[PDB]
Design a protein around this ligand. Structure first.
Ligand code: FAD
Ligand code: FAD
Ligand code: TFB
Ligand code: TFB
Lengths: 468, 468
């Protein structure tokens, strides 16, 4: 292997104490920057949580719960009475006074809960719902729902769907280009049957020509084409595919190739070193989406089943946060080589990147990204004119496209993301959790744990090593 | 009295059979227009009710309620199970598996329910929340909360508040003018202590100089100033005040005086005849807001207490709808004399006016209006570019400004409006009520009642004459 590829392999499952300890000083924000990040994060979170006065309304309630010493059911009952009294029109009058069921249920619940996360059932429908926010300065990336093709027919169908989508997105883009215009996002698992266990030779013979074909088509329309990151044991083969792609003569001088990297992996900073070298060698600027990662629950389960020396992902959420910040700094340092795309719904992560990107923003420096049905409210404060009180930074919405038949796995990942007590989007909804704790600096949080526990970067107390 | 003023007085409490019968042919939409109004009303209501697929989601539920013959509590329980199963990360695992309390309560409930209807606590705050929709083509009218002044001090305070507001709105308007720019809306009851029983002489001596002063100030800033319509026994004195105002030399050639007329009153079309003559005589274009009316419940109660020969308002809601359409036609016929402002949250009423206004709309022909916290969703389909799928017709939002201390009566009127089973905004929320019934033509509805009951315009069966 090359030096950079070798360093990736060696970090696959490195002990958490070691990985976190080495990331800490790279993630640490200089005091002045940390202070500005905190103020901004607080302001974003405050406006988001309290757009409709949720905390104030919650407080007024508690106040009356004391000025009468009433229970919850008591207060509510009183409000119902008060409500009925307020409907008296005249103030004087008022004053004076088997398995098929379970299978069907699961499928239905999937559709119902999933609707909010889906942009359109077809690319035409999805594209129709774009101008609304595109006119506000939002950008889109259409991500076809449908993954882990099981048969050759399945993979063929997905391929045809991607090709069709690129034609439609490309026509809609109408020359706007890879930055300002919409792009497409693809899953390698959709393009090759049984990708999860596919061997190198077959992937290169069968998957790669498809990846190449789609990328050439994207180039013809000058739209971005992004390669989603999936399970951790597919990282290596995805880098082999990216490497070959970047050296295609027909793609020379074109910078529309995109690639996701997952900060929850111990390999992430080493993958960045590789990507930096690859951009240099292939003479291009790579569009790199930095994300935390969507498969954490399954990654933990897989590792515990395989009984290996460790986990490929962190086991405490705050460590993933630290990884993300350290990786963000690395990406921002090389603007000639990488166009970083910072995917997050987290107000602190957003504010930290905003400050880390430094003075003198220019549109092509970087962008933020979010998922449809999750990020729009937060980014309404971000994308738009400074005169309208926004930060004037671009955000690209990832827009799932597909019917109920392709939605299941994506929906489950969204449930896990939204429902986890560690997720920012879960915690911000809790009016009980103080804003300062919500936007707490992750580096400081890690040092706090270290002081309590006796060393830095210890694994989650409830997630022992697989061999234990 | 003049001919027109005399005709108003004579219609005060005319029998409903008579009033409705005479309105019917003036309200009737020609077959071609009625058809276009129906299609548009249906489309508006469909998009409004089903923006987030409410009816479709409701149907999918009923479908499973049959493919298993389950109860509501049953279906729900199943969904909770399905939801828990969808949170299993791996599919294989899933597959394999005293009075102070009441007074305090009423006040608190008022604040909580009222927040959605209030634009700002102060004019500065309200104005701050304006650009968002103003940039979309929406206009504003700021209506200071606070009415029925009880003391001289009270009325003085309201006066000072109006003056301050006009300065702030006028500065914000910055020369945009009476049509494109924001205006103010005033309540005569706020400007004179115990207005409800005030005598003509005192009103002219004390109230009128205040009305004149505010109107002159509005003119200096070239913003609209609208006189709200309140209880029916104050109609006459309000016309006396308007008459005098329109002949002030300092207001000559200025068309920013506005006046509300309430279609639920039997006098409404006669008031229009008067207003038409007044515009002609005083050489101006009057800004006339056509509304249905906000005080219906209290009007019925007052009439039943006074034991007079009849009601000053209609007793069936569909009659008020018919009155509104007939009055709208009258206003639209005289564009040189009246700038009509059609206040409604009703999709049929909106669509009917749209069609009645005819071909070749121009901005100064007319506008729609709505209340903050009620109309924005419907008018999001109306105000905006045709390319964005909107009707490209202007809407002015009435924006209440005030603290909790001035909010009570307004809030109660909003509760009555939103909570009445006859209100469009109540009925559209009922996914059980078919769209075609929701947007049913009121003239046809009245003829249907007439065929069933034996004559046209009979009173509400549950609202007999006061003397009965
Ligand atoms: C536009 C976009 C594209 C994306 N593309 C991909 C993609 O191709 N592949 C992919 O895998 N993800 C992708 N993601 C990321 C993913 O889907 C989640 O949205 C993301 O991880 C949420 O991070 P956050 O900063 O918004 O929320 P935060 O609440 O700040 O952090 C959320 C999470 O931290 C992690 N986590 C949770 N618990 C732990 C723990 N105990 N230990 C360590 N880590 C933990 C997770 O990665 C997780 O989602 C994408 C996200 C976006 C917005
Ligand atoms: C911008 C704006 C300004 C307004 N200004 C004023 C004002 O100065 N003074 C004022 O009094 N109102 C005013 N209103 C009107 C009022 O507040 C209500 O919003 C209005 O009457 C609702 O009509 P709608 O077409 O939206 O709803 P719809 O559901 O179509 O009709 C609603 C209603 O019909 C009436 N009604 C209900 N039941 C009956 C019945 N049994 N018999 C006869 N009529 C019945 C009422 O007038 C009532 O509100 C204003 C409204 C707006 C939007
Ligand atoms: O499929 C997922 O969950 C993530 C987010 C978007 C693409 O990769
Ligand atoms: O006070 C009311 O309820 C109505 C609506 C706005 C002004 O007059």
């Amino acid at each position: 292997q090359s030096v950079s590829r070798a360093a990736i392999t060696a970090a696959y499952r490195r002990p958490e104490t070691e990985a976190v300890s080495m990331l800490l000083e790279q993630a640490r924000l200089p005091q002045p920057v940390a202070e500005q990040a905190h103020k901004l994060a607080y302001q974003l979170a405050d406006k988001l949580r309290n757009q409709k006065n949720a905390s104030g309304r919650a407080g007024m309630v508690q106040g009356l719960l004391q000025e009468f010493s009433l229970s919850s059911q008591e207060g509510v009952a009183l409000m119902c009475l008060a409500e009925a009294l307020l409907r008296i029109p005249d103030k004087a009058t008022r004053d004076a006074l088997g398995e098929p069921l379970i299978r069907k249920g699961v499928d239905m619940a999937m559709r119902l809960m999933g609707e909010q996360f889906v942009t359109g059932e077809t690319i035409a429908e999805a594209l129709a719902n774009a101008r609304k926010l595109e006119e506000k300065g939002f950008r889109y990336s259409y991500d076809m729902l449908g993954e882990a093709a099981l048969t050759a027919a399945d993979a063929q169908a997905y391929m045809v769907s991607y090709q069709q989508a690129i034609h439609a997105i490309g026509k809609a883009s109408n020359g706007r280009g890879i930055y300002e215009g919409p792009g497409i996002s693809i899953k390698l698992s959709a393009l090759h049957p049984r990708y999860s266990r596919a061997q190198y030779d077959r992937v290169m013979e069968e998957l790669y020509p498809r990846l190449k074909s789609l990328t050439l088509l994207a180039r013809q329309y000058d739209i971005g084409i992004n390669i989603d990151a999936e399970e951790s044991d597919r990282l290596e083969i995805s880098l082999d595919l990216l490497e070959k792609l970047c050296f295609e003569p027909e793609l020379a001088g074109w910078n529309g190739i995109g690639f996701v990297i997952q900060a929850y992996q111990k390999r992430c900073p080493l993958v960045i070193d590789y990507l930096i070298d690859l951009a240099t060698r292939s003479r291009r600027r790579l569009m790199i989406r930095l994300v935390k990662g969507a498969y954490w629950d399954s990654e933990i389960k897989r590792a515990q089943m395989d009984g290996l020396e460790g986990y490929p992902v962190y086991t405490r959420k705050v460590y993933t946060d630290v990884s993300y910040l350290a990786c963000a700094k690395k990406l921002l340092a090389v603007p000639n080589l990488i166009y970083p795309q910072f995917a997050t719904h987290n107000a602190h992560t957003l504010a930290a990147i905003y400050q880390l990107a430094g003075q003198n923003y220019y549109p092509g420096q970087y962008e933020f990204q979010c998922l449809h049905g999750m990020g729009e409210p937060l980014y309404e404060q971000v994308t738009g004119k400074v005169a309208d009180g926004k930060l004037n930074r671009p955000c690209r919405i990832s827009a799932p496209v597909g019917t109920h038949e392709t939605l299941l796995a994506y929906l489950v990942r969204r449930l896990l993301e939204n429902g986890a007590n560690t997720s920012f989007v879960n915690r911000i909804a809790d009016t009980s959790l103080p804003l300062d704790e919500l936007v707490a600096d992750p580096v400081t949080a890690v040092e706090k744990l270290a002081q309590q526990e006796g060393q830095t970067g210890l694994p989650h107390p409830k997630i022992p090593l697989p061999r234990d």
